[PDB]
Symmetry: D2
């Protein structure tokens, strides 16, 4: 299991050709699971789910998809509401790979996409595992934009190493996790012209008239599958209070909260997260 | 594994002799775990943890203790703040059985006792698993007394079958769980003179000057072990909002919430609860 | 100011003739305000706003409207989603009386109607004052149905004096407010054949396909006027946690909470409520 | 009413002589009220309560006290838990001026001091008005330190104009309120050697063994007077979720929340705040 051995590309149709990069592992396992990574301008499937893919691959057929604008998937200069955009791409991939109904694992931005997908193509989404998910969260107490959102916005405005480091440091409870080699690695990816284009496209999409598609806390009462919401108690991007509406309105919801854990649950509580997910997904 | 095969008695000292009834199972397993049952006038270890003891016994050395006033333990006509009272009894049992530091599983009233014990004898309590625990909960939004508390109070005032049934029905999300044979069984136990005495003793203890000992939400910031808070989203006795202070202030806290689950988590989500507990306790 | 001196009738069109009863006071005052009373089968404008109408009339032109199914307004044997139904009736009254844009004061059920109206006829609703409002509230922590809702349902099933008293007692923090003469008065009104018909119509309307119209917490982000949410900390019908979504999503929201106050804010904190409303409404 | 006309000094005893600066107005009014300003290294009574003192002086005898470490009061290089320290100073002033029981108005840091005082000298504190108060607040959902706390800490570490501006901008919902002349004014005050000393003393006091004195959310259940908690919905220093424990546990609590209002309630909602306070204080 290396980046290269698991790398795959697909071309799907979303208002024309869109190249999607993904990682495939655990081929031969019966149950397929799709993983959808978090935000942050230099983020991608492989780095996001580094402490997870190999473990999950022992039990599942794992497809970890780079979301349009990220990793090695296409980075268009414009799109509509992002989650609906990425969900359209995912549907294309489902159809192309012949997937029927499949559980989705999504963090942050990727949680919003898993939810958008599960709402837009209800028959295609099985059980959901969502870690500090965007979109379905609404921060009832935390003033928006939150500190995590503001720090990401600052980088988008001024893409400096310093701004990326300040952003990364609010992703985690244990800030020692934010090493110089981590910062340098993400910055190199984050600061490419193509990443800058994606960041620009994202910012512009917020001002779209299809913004309601992002307010998924209004819709999740319609979800019929079990949904495991997982949060870091110390999430500074999508804070804990953002879990409440989804917890209340999703009939088969569960919530697990980890103390001493920031926004990156899959990293900071990787073992606990792994086992929770394996058990939940059968 | 039957009531009789696992039944044990111990005499401990709490201002004089106090007989404690408990159940022992999984002898030969290395890790001891103590289970502390919930409230409700006819409740006891064996019925409370019916869907749990055998499963947990496969992995642990289980000691499920009838709390003073319940089951086959002594039912004194008076005592001080209940959780501190039961914690004193438990300490006596720990010493007598030669237990050192041991994880505690407690629901409702028994969760309050596990917490009181863990605060009063800090070296003796290991990891805690607490299901809709009293004492450390403070219902920030729900007006007190809650519906569950009021229904229990009504029975204590008028110990009729009808009042017990109304009380039992707010213990669970799935009210079909409250069968006639369940009601009759609990009522027979609940309505003994000795149970009535215990109920009377309990009511009187509320008016004690040691009431602060019950306000454990003020103290749990001192707990140093991992603590897994487990709640039924639909708990009508100790509702979900009562989890917040404990979640925020216990450094190593986790919270798991089950949708479509009432106050009796160990019954309504028995399999999920069992696996969560086994994993948490190593 | 007596019931009789202020009594008025109007016939409006809601799928045919609908008679609305209301009270008019403070004629000659420049600013019109519409008051919408709470639920409870024997409730009406005059009794609901007894400690309020005369005070408010000193400053405003007050129109306190009996909502269809209540007081001396028509009690049809069937209707759609209640708030939308009552809002349709109110629109008819606005048009008929030549009202333009007017502030609305609504408690409980009447708060839901004020909100439905403000959403359906956006140009016609000015500032809103909403006391423990239904509809826009969603109880993020309290299991539904709440104790207040359950007690009302029990009466609807078994319309006995005893059941009405149990219901009334969860309307207030100070239960001494629930006197025998109050109970008898409400029961006489509550137990008429026509009230029973309205109760029956209401129960049936819940099962309608237009239920979304009642989930107003999904829509209030669209409200553009100042909105003063007022709650009794001890509200056992629509508890405090039900305020959160509306507080977060209404751009110009305020919230005032009274400790030692139940569901009937306008009664239990009548002076404070009166002054708050007068100030808020200019 | 100018700074100079209202300026007063007093020498009180807190482990030796401590000079307190305060402003006196509305002399001849019967009801005395004490105002306690917020934090921020260059803050003081006069600037904190600029939009308030003259208005309140029409109705009350106002004493707005510079808290030790601030304004023209003594700035010692060391002290214990700050709120208890300031409360000791205030007691000295009460005794010296012959005040008996007097209502307290406190924001932020000053709210914590009003509360500490009301707990330590229960007979001396009347009704409390507390705006986004420190100390009694505990942020059940917001990870600590909050963005406001972090920005203040950054200035304390690196006292630059830029850091002060970033801090000030999270004090308000309307960031246009943070003008260049405001920044320059606060920075000049904030960056004096004596202010730096106070900041240093404050930071050091956090590490004291008397830290429990700051955890006032544990004690406010003991307050017997009416308490009006006032919050800006968008408070980024002491966010709204920090109001809950105090709201629940203070028997005679009220809460008022203003949407579109940050941490500086007394500035951003000055008129509404003024009227609320005047009414509450009789």
């Amino acid at each position: 299991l290396t980046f290269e051995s698991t790398s795959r590309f697909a071309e799907v149709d979303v208002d024309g050709p869109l190249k999607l990069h993904y990682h495939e592992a655990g081929v031969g396992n019966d149950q397929t699971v799709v993983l959808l990574h978090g935000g942050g301008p230099g983020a991608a499937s492989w780095t996001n789910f580094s402490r997870n893919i190999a473990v999950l691959a022992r039990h599942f057929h794992v497809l970890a998809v780079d979301q349009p604008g990220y990793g090695h998937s296409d980075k268009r200069a414009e799109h509509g509401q992002f989650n609906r955009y990425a969900a359209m791409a995912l549907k294309g991939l489902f159809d192309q790979l012949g997937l029927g109904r499949v559980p989705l694992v999504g963090n942050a931005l990727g949680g919003g996409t898993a939810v958008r997908f599960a709402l837009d193509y209800p028959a295609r989404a099985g059980r959901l595992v969502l870690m500090g998910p965007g979109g379905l969260s609404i921060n009832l107490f935390a003033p928006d934009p939150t500190e995590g959102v503001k720090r990401l916005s600052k980088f988008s405005v001024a893409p400096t190493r310093e701004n990326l480091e300040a952003f990364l440091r609010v992703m985690v409870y244990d800030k020692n996790l934010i090493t110089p080699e981590l910062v340098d690695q993400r910055f190199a990816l984050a600061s490419t012209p193509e990443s800058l284009t994606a960041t620009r496209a994202m910012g512009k999409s917020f001002a779209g008239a299809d913004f309601e598609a992002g307010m998924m806390w209004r819709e999740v009462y319609r979800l019929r599958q079990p949904v495991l919401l997982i949060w870091g108690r110390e999430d500074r991007v999508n804070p804990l209070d953002g879990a409440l509406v989804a917890l209340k309105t999703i009939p088969r919801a569960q919530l697990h909260v980890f103390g001493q854990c920031g926004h990156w649950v899959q990293v900071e509580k990787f073992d606990e997260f792994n086992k929770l997910t394996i058990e939940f997904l059968g």
